[PDB]
Amino acid sequence: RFLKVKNWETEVVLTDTLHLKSTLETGCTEYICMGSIMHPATKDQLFPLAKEFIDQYYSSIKRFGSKAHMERLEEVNKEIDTTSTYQLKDTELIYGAKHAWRNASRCVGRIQWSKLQVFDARDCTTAHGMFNYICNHVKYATNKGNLRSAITIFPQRTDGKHDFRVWNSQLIRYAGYKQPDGSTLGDPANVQFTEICIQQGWKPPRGRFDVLPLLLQANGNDPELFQIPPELVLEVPIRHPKFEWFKDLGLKWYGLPAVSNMLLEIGGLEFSACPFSGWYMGTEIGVRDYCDNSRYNILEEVAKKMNLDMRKTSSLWKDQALVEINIAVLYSFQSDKVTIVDHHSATESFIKHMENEYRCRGGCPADWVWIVPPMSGSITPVFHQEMLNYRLTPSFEYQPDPWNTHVWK
Amino acid sequence: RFLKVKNWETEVVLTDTLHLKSTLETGCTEYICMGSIMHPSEDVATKDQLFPLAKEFIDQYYSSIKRFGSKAHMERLEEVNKEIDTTSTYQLKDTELIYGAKHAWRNASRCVGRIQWSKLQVFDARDCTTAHGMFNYICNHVKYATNKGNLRSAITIFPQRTDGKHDFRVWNSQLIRYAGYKQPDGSTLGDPANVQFTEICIQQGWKPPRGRFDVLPLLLQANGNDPELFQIPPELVLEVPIRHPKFEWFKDLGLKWYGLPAVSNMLLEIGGLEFSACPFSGWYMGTEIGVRDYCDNSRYNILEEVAKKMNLDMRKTSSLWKDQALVEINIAVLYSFQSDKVTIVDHHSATESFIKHMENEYRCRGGCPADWVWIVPPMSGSITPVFHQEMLNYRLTPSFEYQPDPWNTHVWK
Ligand code: HEM
Ligand code: HEM
Ligand SMILES: Cc1cc(N)nc(CCc2cc(CCN)cc(F)c2F)c1
Ligand SMILES: Cc1cc(N)nc(CCc2cc(CCN)cc(F)c2F)c1
Ligand SMILES: Cc1cc(N)nc(CCc2cc(CCN)cc(F)c2F)c1
Ligand SMILES: C[C@H](O)[C@H](O)[C@H]1CNc2nc(N)[nH]c(=O)c2N1
Ligand SMILES: C[C@H](O)[C@H](O)[C@H]1CNc2nc(N)[nH]c(=O)c2N1
Ligand SMILES: [Zn+2]
């Protein structure tokens, strides 16, 4: 009734008891494992989700079953009778937001989990208010380059008709344009959203790295376009410490990764607009953003200027060019004093974290498929780490795109 | 009953119906996924356990040859059923043996090489009775499979398990491996992965040359008896010296690797029968050597030396000095194997072939069990197509399974 996991590089073994607290499906069964699938209330249903979280919280402050505690257990249960839902105390919102990050199985950055700055935006009511909260988030988090992790939490879902949503998948993305001759300008992953913003009245500059506008939806109304003041959008020009022609590539990338399309679930409530931001692992930019074939796809471009044998795959010209690109990302950010972590430091930090979590908490849900970096996998320590994956609450979940689901006016 | 998988690089979606035939545990539950665990958690079948397993294997063999429900199919079932009832086991026809072996390979969810599953040379060694006999069967396998560098997939199959007390085992984990010697001071000579098995060999009288690339003796076990030592004849062990197309100094490293990878510690399960000794071999993907064998810290661990020779700034990690030297190593391995006309496949060619295979298998067979954590190569993962491919993992039989290390199990005399 316990589970061990081994590190085959170190032969260290850890015992998992924390898993005895999951409930949502993994999607796997004893007959099929779905570890690589990207995606596998009423009166009744809300009470116990709230109940278990309050017990969770009060257990986290020594005072489990305390004289206080039951008054909150009382008050929360009382409020659900009247408003149907209920509202978290500031204490609960901060705990719940920090623990959703703590339980994000796919996040390698979680050693930093309790150093989360929470911004309570639950008094927001209009897209204009949303824009204001988001601008203050970006400015705080960017912090001239000394980035700090933060989340802004907008009002919880109530009936579905009046959701608050950030339609951008991230606060800061570059735009994607369909070129008349079948090709794509900018970031290909963003063609659809970019066409919506254009359809919505955005006047695109139609270059590669055009920062998309914010498309914010408050209280179920139609979304509205807002352009983020550029003085808040910190960007880095990508140069190489060896190749002088590298600056000639015209490459830049922004400094603030901020996820804005996910759903945060605390005690049964559903915060559908909860943008959060950290700082980059270099491979996110170098390997995935620049080198996916469905993204900026610069491998051919870089190897050409490196003059590499591009005919046979066994020359490993893609591998060589990949390493160089990621050297330039990490070097460009460090030269411009913008926070960045390479995949070796990042993965070394996550082994520490797993060690911490097993000692003080008894388990750390982790998704090997996402924690292992997209490059040089086995030379990082997480590659040889067995992990158990299980779903703990509070949690970040996916949700449908608003445009697939929104009935306009 | 109609599970979907998506490729996130191409948007292709495939429909899996084959999963309905799955069986033994994945190791996962609705509450915990174990897809990154390496393993799970007198033991021989009864007449009652065996009847169903055999029937279903026979039913599926006869379905494969478009003879399901035929009189041949019906007599075979009755022949098997009676044999299990009288002898508490049964013997596969040779045709069934070959189909079973090929389909355990087809079914092997961790194998990226499966596009070759049906071109497999099966050697029926079920008439073997002694360790000397095994040595001979293995020598023939090595020579056939090596083929002067034009490698050829093969398996040799020794007698099936009876009561567990009389098993055939190849105590080696692979038929060709380099010895590893721990030292007084904690350093290791050779291959640190093989320190234990080397010590066993030495205990059994093997006189070790104590070198960085010593081919281990074979340690063969017939019919539950004590294992016995045999030296593979060196002329049958094809090796490749590792050099680099650009760095003249790379040969000064003194690297070499053997050409033939051949797994000899697994168990082949066909129709409820267990062939505890079934060495099988193919050809290498370069990353197996150039990433895992040479660059794992618990292995030969040469990144340090190679970076040095490349004059790499190794002060910080964010120089990516390990990444940079790992690439030039794997370039050298591909270049060496190719230079000497020894069959090898790079990780990009191999993953592209496997996507092609996996699609054809959905189309023609209705699914293709795959283990993402093992299919993705341990370098440059996301620039290979398997990284963006959703995969369903389930156990199809016939199958290769892990089994305990024999030295942990065997009782001596
Ligand atoms: C502080 C620096 C951080 C780093 C270096 C980091 C690193 C990463 C990386 C590399 C991924 C993979 C993302 C992808 O491939 O698209 C990821 C996923 C994730 N991170 Fe972090 N992270 C950080 C902070 C945070 C914070 C502050 C939160 C929430 C408050 C968070 C929650 C998540 C979640 C929920 C995912 C899953 C994404 C998904 O399912 O698509 N992370 N993280
Ligand atoms: C023909 C060329 C082949 C190639 C290129 C190939 C490739 C691979 C690779 C790269 C692995 C991962 C191994 C590791 O990281 O330790 C693997 C695993 C495996 N292969 Fe293949 N293989 C080939 C032939 C075969 C054959 C002939 C069989 C059986 C008849 C087979 C059955 C397996 C099995 C059972 C595993 C799982 C190993 C384990 O879980 O320890 N393969 N293969
Ligand atoms: C909090 C956080 C930190 C970090 N270090 N990374 C992320 C993911 C960010 C991200 C992902 C994707 C692709 C998601 N499939 C595109 C982006 F523009 C983006 F910012 C989030
Ligand atoms: C048939 C086959 C083909 C291939 N291409 N690869 C393999 C795995 C072979 C192998 C694995 C390990 C590590 C096992 N823990 C060490 C070896 F020396 C070795 F040959 C098997
Ligand atoms: C998915 C799966 C495939 C297979 N053939 N057999 C099993 C049974 C138990 C088992 C064996 C192995 C080693 C053989 N792959 C790895 C596992 F994760 C595992 F659960 C499971
Ligand atoms: C813990 C983890 O499951 C382990 O390191 C696995 C990961 N993936 C692998 N993939 C392959 N091909 N070979 C391996 O040995 C491993 N090891
Ligand atoms: C198919 C596969 O599950 C999918 O491509 C996953 C694999 N691992 C990943 N890991 C990270 N960090 N990010 C990703 O987008 C993915 N994609
Ligand atoms: Zn699973």
Swiss-Prot record, chain A:
KW Ribosomal protein (keyword) present: no
Domain of life according to the entry: Eukaryota
Binding positions (heme b): C107, Y398
Chain residues that bind (6R)-L-erythro-5,6,7,8-tetrahydrobiopterin: S36, V369, W370, F383
Protein's cellular compartments: Cell membrane, Sarcolemma; Cell projection, Dendritic spine
Residues reported in the UniProt entry to bind L-arginine: Q170, W279, Y280, E284
GO molecular function annotations of the record: arginine binding; cadmium ion binding; calcium channel regulator activity; calcium-dependent protein binding; calmodulin binding; flavin adenine dinucleotide binding; FMN binding; heme binding
GO biological process: arginine catabolic process; calcium ion transport; cell redox homeostasis; cellular response to growth factor stimulus; establishment of localization in cell; multicellular organismal response to stress; myoblast fusion; negative regulation of blood pressure
The UniProt record lists the keyword Coiled coil: no
A GO term from the CC aspect: postsynaptic density
Post-translational modification as stated in the protein's UniProt record: Ubiquitinated; mediated by STUB1/CHIP in the presence of Hsp70 and Hsp40 (in vitro).
Tissue: Isoform 1 is ubiquitously expressed: detected in skeletal muscle and brain, also in testis, lung and kidney, and at low levels in heart, adrenal gland and retina. Not detected in the platelets. Isoform 3 is expressed only in testis. Isoform 4 is detected in testis, skeletal muscle, lung, and kidney, at low levels in the brain, but not in the heart and adrenal gland.
Keywords: Calmodulin-binding, Cell membrane, Cell projection, FAD, Flavoprotein, FMN, Heme, Iron, Membrane, Metal-binding, NADP, Oxidoreductase, Phosphoprotein, Synapse, Ubl conjugation
Domain notes: The PDZ domain participates in protein-protein interaction, and is responsible for targeting nNos to synaptic membranes. Mediates interaction with VAC14.
Functional description taken from the UniProt entry: Produces nitric oxide (NO) which is a messenger molecule with diverse functions throughout the body. In the brain and peripheral nervous system, NO displays many properties of a neurotransmitter. Probably has nitrosylase activity and mediates cysteine S-nitrosylation of cytoplasmic target proteins such SRR.
Subunit structure, interactors included: Homodimer. Interacts with DLG4; the interaction possibly being prevented by the association between NOS1 and CAPON. Forms a ternary complex with CAPON and RASD1. Forms a ternary complex with CAPON and SYN1. Interacts with ZDHHC23. Interacts with NOSIP; which may impair its synaptic location. Interacts with HTR4. Interacts with SLC6A4. Interacts with VAC14. Interacts (via N-terminal domain) with DLG4 (via N-terminal tandem pair of PDZ domains). Interacts with SLC6A4.
Annotated family: Belongs to the NOS family.
Protein name (record): Nitric oxide synthase 1
